[PDB]
Design a protein around this nucleic acid. Structure first.
Length: 73
DNA sequence: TGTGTTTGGGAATCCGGTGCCGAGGCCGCTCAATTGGTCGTAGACAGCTCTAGCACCGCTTAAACGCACGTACGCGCTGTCCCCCGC
């Protein structure tokens, strides 16, 4: 399954008012058996694609270093 | 979500009493500083030599300088996780 679903599912499972950090996303995907080490660069890209698709709102920071929430709009 | 100000409250500080022991003074003594004198020599001074430090010049080339260009490291920001702190 593509990493955009795994990320969206992790952000939905950890839904809050702040927003899953990249470190929490790493932890959730690793707990989901996804190798976050080798494919970290893929994650940053896929995450960026999800922000560029507007599917994730950046709530703090800039780019992948930030916190993110599912764009309910 | 943020922050100027509030206010009871522990913690450091000030003040007065007090008492106690060491610092300051006094005395008797002694031994080390002082006086005077002799004598030896350490070094102050003159004087002489020669070396090695300074100033200069010219030439070559290697290093320093300025500049273009790119990337990688420093630094700021965010997050988390845990391990020292206060009690």
């Amino acid at each position: 399954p593509p990493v955009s679903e795994l990320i969206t599912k992790a952000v939905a499972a950890s839904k809050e008012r702040s927003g899953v950090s990249l470190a929490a996303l790493k932890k959730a995907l690793a707990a989901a058996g996804y190798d976050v080490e080798k494919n970290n660069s893929r994650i940053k890209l896929g995450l960026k694609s999800l922000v560029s698709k507007g599917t994730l709102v950046q709530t703090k920071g800039t780019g992948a270093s930030g916190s993110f929430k599912l764009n309910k709009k």
